[PDB]
Motif scaffolding. Structure first.
Motif, PDB file in Angstrom:
ATOM      1  N   UNK C   4      60.216  37.599  26.193  1.00 33.26           N
ATOM      2  CA  UNK C   4      59.331  36.612  26.785  1.00 33.26           C
ATOM      3  C   UNK C   4      57.932  37.179  26.965  1.00 33.26           C
ATOM      4  N   UNK C   6      54.566  36.607  29.422  1.00 30.20           N
ATOM      5  CA  UNK C   6      54.297  36.125  30.770  1.00 30.20           C
ATOM      6  C   UNK C   6      52.795  36.200  31.008  1.00 30.20           C
ATOM      7  N   UNK C   8      49.359  34.923  33.519  1.00 25.51           N
ATOM      8  CA  UNK C   8      49.059  34.739  34.931  1.00 25.51           C
ATOM      9  C   UNK C   8      47.751  33.984  35.124  1.00 25.51           C
ATOM     10  N   UNK C 520      52.107  31.095  37.109  1.00 29.59           N
ATOM     11  CA  UNK C 520      52.694  31.944  36.080  1.00 29.59           C
ATOM     12  C   UNK C 520      53.315  31.042  35.020  1.00 29.59           C
ATOM     13  N   UNK C 521      53.112  31.380  33.749  1.00 28.55           N
ATOM     14  CA  UNK C 521      53.745  30.674  32.640  1.00 28.55           C
ATOM     15  C   UNK C 521      54.581  31.666  31.843  1.00 28.55           C
ATOM     16  N   UNK C 522      55.835  31.303  31.583  1.00 35.31           N
ATOM     17  CA  UNK C 522      56.775  32.134  30.839  1.00 35.31           C
ATOM     18  C   UNK C 522      57.108  31.424  29.533  1.00 35.31           C
ATOM     19  N   UNK C 524      58.609  32.135  25.280  1.00 35.11           N
ATOM     20  CA  UNK C 524      59.275  33.054  24.369  1.00 35.11           C
ATOM     21  C   UNK C 524      58.279  33.668  23.393  1.00 35.11           C
TER      22      UNK C 524
END
Ligand SMILES: Nc1ncnc2c1ncn2[C@@H]1O[C@H](COP(=O)(O)OP(=O)(O)OP(=O)(O)O)[C@@H](O)[C@H]1O
Ligand SMILES: Nc1ncnc2c1ncn2[C@@H]1O[C@H](COP(=O)(O)OP(=O)(O)OP(=O)(O)O)[C@@H](O)[C@H]1O
Ligand SMILES: Nc1ncnc2c1ncn2[C@@H]1O[C@H](COP(=O)(O)OP(=O)(O)OP(=O)(O)O)[C@@H](O)[C@H]1O
Ligand SMILES: [K+]
Ligand SMILES: [K+]
Ligand SMILES: [K+]
Ligand SMILES: [Mg+2]
Ligand SMILES: [Mg+2]
Ligand SMILES: [Mg+2]
Lengths: 527, 527, 527
Positions: C4, C6, C8, C520-522, C524
């Motif tokens: 993943x 990540x 911010x 926060x965005x997660x 793949x």
């Protein structure tokens, strides 16, 4: 047999701490009343928006395997906290990161990390004892509403609806959360014994307004086997016709010639009768059918043990309900005339069955049967404009329900990270056996300030100054991060369940202090 | 048929030593009371944390083929030590690394490595004889607790609980280790004939508090075949009803009409009876059935040899217990009124069957049967906050159990590597046949200091000075690495089982002295 | 378990806003009377040309996953607006983009985005209440034509044909849209009771001009089972021959020797008879058969409940129709002589069935049955030169049909974005609880001008000046973007359904204010 990479000492520890730090930094933005959300990409459809710490933790895996080991360990911390308490996973994540970082800083040549971990565990046991001394039982439903409001991120309506549900079905009652199709949350209380089986034939409808079958003061006939012959159904119909009283037949199935007899007698002469399938798909079906027999005062027919036949039925073998409503998808029985003592004996039997089951799925069935026999069930339908909003609010509703159940079980402490802050003087009175245990005790002592600092940092203020001013304050005074003021935490309703706080601390400390004992990391070569 | 790479002499030996050094460096950090842990990545889930040398050894495979050959050989050393002794794998790994390194240093043009290996094996035989002269048998359970405490990395509670288990079930009794769902370890002692078979039908329950069937002074009926007919079950019920005693039926299955008769007589008139499936799948089923028949004083029915039928049952063909508990999953028989002399005859039969078995799976079944007949079984449940902690502690519990069994077998010597240190004067009195055997003897003589050096190095002190002060001290004085002191090792309980020490030395020496005879290495070309 | 990425804070929000901006920029070109079209490539064939906002939204997926998350969220906005209202998806998209942009601009260290979202939702509730106070119910069919004309992008002919359809079949009647093979639109009104079942055999044709069977004052025979025997069919034929009346046989199937009897009697002597398969597959077949029996005054034969047999038929068990037309593919029954009270009772039965169903598939079946029994169905055939033109015009016809149904349900407001523009003083009178809620109220206040600015911008004029002059004007005056003039909107017919406007606002606001809470965005890692 796969090729491996082996790293030693501070380099491996720094990579593992980088993984721990990334996962904990992503989790920590969600903490407290001014926490923010995390958007997670889903492969199939819409992305997921969440404030839930364990959901954020489980969604993060790292390409670097040394970082991914630390990420997996803090994932274990959050998952264990979620399975034990259903809340406090963000607190557990930040505590685990703090313990891991402080332990990694203290490893030198002369240090013994296993004895440091022993000191950590001793300090955690002391803090948990101090937490149990600080705890107070929940006595008023206002405390229930306050706990649910705090755990639902300050949503007073969620706290009120959970408090109403626990007023109606009991603090230990069955409350379920499901999707609502409206914009607002609605609480549905299902009383009596309602199950998910409708009428077998649509011809049995006598109330055409709602397309449902409604009887008052109806006989109940309960069969453990299928009813398919003339002789198995005719004498019960003779009893119902001679008494001039409606009959409800609940069996495994009614079909064949018996169904044709029922439809013919309802359509032609106007016999009041309805046939419903039995709920369940195994021994649960037999258990629920016997529960219906006890609650209505009837007897089960075609059973394996007693072997009671439907050809010889007496009027005392039929249950009596004051009201029955059968719709297309469900049926419900009201005011069964069973013996109260027998219902109580069945209730204590279900309780003693619950005491000896650990499958975590039959316990739900036993709790459902107990709720049907005693108090009913509550359904919280969560409103929202879209599915992403509904899921986001559903996470907080589930968190508030779990926290309220935990507070009912084990009491409440001060919220806002202040309960762990007030356990520091319990650590100040300990006597360590050696220097490594002293190091572990001081690690836990530094870690005890972390949740309050994180809550204050997410509120945009300086966390260390807030924590020091809390420590100089009286024991009842903490920091309202939502109001930006130092208040009485119990009076303002900023309270936490004791079980959640101690679970988060223990689950963080065990894994993180095990992680800080490492000297060598072995990973597969990336292919 | 695949293409091969061939390397000669010192370059091949240096690459093999690099592989040996990598694996031994990873293993050696775990050695002793100040050893640290190794984290191993697992593909399917959370990583493994371990202090176990053979686990670290088996996890490491190298991409370079020549390094991987040395890694595979030291893996063989650790695996053979673990299979023979269950402990001492780290000591075996560091001894094998020492022997391999010092043998590779001594290879020259005029050297004969096969005769060097002969000298190594002669020196190892001399050291093993000196170890057996140094050994002392275990006489007190305090020594049992000390051995288990040392082998569990200083955990006194693991040592105490293992000592308690060996007090209750015997030093040769059956003790098993399994997961625990709590924070702390519990010792469960299971007495009598308890097997993982519950009641067939729930209508047999007469004690609703725990959902169990409870009788005292009950007849026991044993059948090797299924009971499905009326006439095979009625006469035993007549005996049980005429004597007014409860009946326990143990058979392959009780189904059909006989089960219906049992449930009907239990529900209607109140006949005290319960039916339990037999345990075992194969000849184990009939073996434990005959064990239960001997222990209760009954006779097995429906057997292939004597062919006793169930339609002609006498009151003396039924076993007599004083107590039986039947729950959902288990059934246990207490105070079986069998002939005692027949029970010891069966016990010696099981013993002589144990003497002639080597399958390593039927021996466990025979030990379980002997424990059920004689002394019961002990179950150690390992507590912990998380699965990684539980597995890490379980490794040390298994190590301490194996070390305690080895100490009951072959006695104890001084711990902390001092037993090998006191075997050096036995090598000083040897007379080599030629120079190569002298080289091998000197290799073993240098290698005997390695475990104490590694233990002291992991404690953050200079190992050579510690080893020289031990050697300049009286024979009872060694280094307490946990306390940093030179102490009486027997008084302080720092003791090792002799079997583990000699197994580690022999397993290291054989493989490493074979490895040092190599001149040419053949590996496949990597595709 | 995949790796993943990540991100911010502001970088993640900027990428998500880039995705939102690209999708909204592509959607916004289609808005209003001077909106333009979007061409979407189809893999299998000819490209698709559309002015429909949700169609444009669903076609756009982005390679960058952070941009794709914002694209998916505004896709959710457009899809939810389309499923609830069937119109207003472009307005919802531009409102959601405005809320997302204004919320992303307002996020700082001290801001609390969840409380900003609370302020947004409170402002939206105030605007929705003001919209409901602004609403006016639809009374004249001229208003219906105006609504359909506006929603069909100014096409007065589509508005007229929809107004004609609602004049014929009712404002709540069944109107369907399908392809037309001509250049022009046609409205077909299907009265009476027509179903897609023709003759069984072509020997029943007596009107050779259209290859159809025509009778006047004919008997009707309704059978729920197959008619394959002589004894089932002959007595009905004797009734029809003795009364010298034609017979129509509606059954599941007519085959075997009954069919040969029918053909032989039609061909040789000239007996007036026709046999038609029954419509429907399941319980819909039986319900439709009972509908025809009630409407014609006949009785269903071969049923499961009453079990009426075909060998004993009386003349009163046959329905009577003044007209029947049986073609190759369909048959229609006209002027059925059933009792009007029973037809009304069946109509209310269908209505109460509609009240208690939410399957969204057999609700259409119930509406079709009610239309067949009461008022008939309307079919709009969309003319065009080619399939791409037909699909493009059909999108606007479907939009106008949905908007007209919404305007019948919930009334109308001023078009051209002026309804949201006149809700601004309702926001100006709100009192926010804190600064974050004030920020949210201001976000909604800026957003309320966006649809009018977008409509004016697509018309080539400066949107801010137009919106300022609308706000300085009296409440009935808005901007005719098509004519470029400031007009009385109600008398010019520029009106919108209230339901569409409030649905677009609510669906935009919920998702976009949830999106602006993210930190926060997660995503793949792309493979
Ligand atoms: N107004 C407030 N002032 C101070 N602290 C507050 C306030 N409201 C809530 N808190 C505290 O915030 C914490 C709850 O934060 P949050 O729910 O985000 O995290 P969590 O419970 O650790 O994890 P999760 O809910 O994600 O499983 C509790 O310690 C609670 O007492
Ligand atoms: N307090 C102590 N002082 C000195 N030596 C000690 C002390 N406690 C244990 N030891 C020694 O440490 C050694 C055991 O270390 P360890 O269990 O890590 O290795 P091992 O038995 O070779 O391998 P493994 O347990 O991984 O199979 C023994 O030689 C034991 O005597
Ligand atoms: N002549 C006009 N002058 C001003 N505004 C107009 C005029 N005709 C239509 N409009 C407005 O244009 C809007 C409709 O635009 P459009 O149909 O392109 O978008 P939509 O309804 O938001 O979305 P979609 O139809 O794509 O689902 C309405 O607000 C309507 O009042
Ligand atoms: K959180
Ligand atoms: K070790
Ligand atoms: K549009
Ligand atoms: Mg929480
Ligand atoms: Mg060991
Ligand atoms: Mg439109």
């Amino acid at each position: 047999g796969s090729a491996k990479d082996v790293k030693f000492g501070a380099d491996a520890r720094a990579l593992m701490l980088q993984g721990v730090d990334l996962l904990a930094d992503a989790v920590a933005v969600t903490m407290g009343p001014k926490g923010r959300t995390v958007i997670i990409e889903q492969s199939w459809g819409s992305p997921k928006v969440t404030k839930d710490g364990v959901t954020v933790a489980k969604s993060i895996d790292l390409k670097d395997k040394y970082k991914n080991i630390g990420a997996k360990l803090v994932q274990d911390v959050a998952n264990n906290t979620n399975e034990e308490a259903g809340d406090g996973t963000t607190t557990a994540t930040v505590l685990a990161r703090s313990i891991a970082k402080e332990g990694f800083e203290k490893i030198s040549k002369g240090a013994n990390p296993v004895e440091i971990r022993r000191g950590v565990m001793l300090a955690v046991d002391a803090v948990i004892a101090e937490l149990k001394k600080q705890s107070k039982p929940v006595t008023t439903p206002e405390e229930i509403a306050q706990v649910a409001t705090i755990s639902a991120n300050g949503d007073k309506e969620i706290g009120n609806i959970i408090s109403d549900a626990m007023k109606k079905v009991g603090r230990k009652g069955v409350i379920t959360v499901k999707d609502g199709k409206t914009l607002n949350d609605e609480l549905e209380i299902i009383e009596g014994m309602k199950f998910d089986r409708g009428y077998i034939s649509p011809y049995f409808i006598n109330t055409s307004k709602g397309q449902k079958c409604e009887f008052q003061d109806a006989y109940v006939l309960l069969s453990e086997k299928k009813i398919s012959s003339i002789q198995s159904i005719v004498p019960a119909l003779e009893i119902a016709n001679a008494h001039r009283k409606p009959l409800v037949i609940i069996a495994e199935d009614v079909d064949g010639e018996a169904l044709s007899t029922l439809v013919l007698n309802r359509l032609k002469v106007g016999l009041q009768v309805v046939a419903v399938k039995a709920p369940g798909f195994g021994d649960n079906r037999k258990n629920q059918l016997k529960d219906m027999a006890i609650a209505t005062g009837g007897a089960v027919f075609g059973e394996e043990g007693l072997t009671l036949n439907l050809e010889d039925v007496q009027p005392h073998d039929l249950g009596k309900v004051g009201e029955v409503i059968v719709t297309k998808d469900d049926a419900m029985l009201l005011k069964g005339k069973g013996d109260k003592a027998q219902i109580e004996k069945r209730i204590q039997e279900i309780i003693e069955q619950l005491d000896v089951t650990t499958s975590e799925y039959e316990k739900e069935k036993l709790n459902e049967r107990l709720a049907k026999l005693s108090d009913g069930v509550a359904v919280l339908k969560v409103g929202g404009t879209s599915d992403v909003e509904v899921n986001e609010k559903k996470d907080r509703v589930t968190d508030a329900l779990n926290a309220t159940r935990a507070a009912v079980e084990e009491g409440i402490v001060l919220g806002g990270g202040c309960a762990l802050l007030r356990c520091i003087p319990a650590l100040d009175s300990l006597t360590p056996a050696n220097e490594d245990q002293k190091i572990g005790i001081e690690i836990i002592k530094r870690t005890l300030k972390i949740p309050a600092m994180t809550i204050a940092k997410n509120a945009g203020v300086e966390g260390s100054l807030i924590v020091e001013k809390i420590m100089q304050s009286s024991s009842e005074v903490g920091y309202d991060a939502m109001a930006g003021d130092f208040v009485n935490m119990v009076e303002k309703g900023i309270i936490d369940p004791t079980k959640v706080v101690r679970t988060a601390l223990l689950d963080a400390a065990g894994v993180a202090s095990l992680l800080t004992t490492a000297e060598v990391v072995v990973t597969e070569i990336p292919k």
